[PDB]
Amino acid sequence: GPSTSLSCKQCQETEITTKNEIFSLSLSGPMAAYVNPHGYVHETLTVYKASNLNLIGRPSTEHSWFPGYAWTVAQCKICASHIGWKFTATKKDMSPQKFWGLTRSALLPTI
């Protein structure tokens, strides 16, 4: 299946993941629109593994789109543009224990 890279749209100097990392966590397919607490809508693609990201702040379950998971904000290591969030399980029974949700508008190609 597709296995080529998704890169930072803003700087185009780093690969973040590959299409073979994409998976469906829920019924809403691998990518869907989610609404944040302030009315910003993020088309979020879920991937198992990502690279070239730096994390900001601490994990939080506030307004988590994926019950049982906490988010940590993730930004491009080169340009610091917001790319998505790392999700980490808050209980052992969950699988996967971690994944990444990447916001569609931050990535090239356009999924």
């Binding site: 944040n36 607490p37 302030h38 910003y40 900001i56 702040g57 601490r58 939080s60 506030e62 988010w71 904000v73 930004q75 610091a80 543009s81 917001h82 969030w85």
Partner: peptide, 27 residues
């Protein structure tokens, strides 16, 4: 320690000044 939050992504900051710059960069 990081009381200032970005309303677009949830990024938190110690310095409100850094928040302001971060918000600008979303544009």
């Amino acid at each position: 320690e990081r009381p200032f939050h970005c309303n677009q992504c949830g990024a938190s900051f110690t310095q409100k000044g850094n928040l302001l710059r971060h918000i600008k960069l979303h544009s």
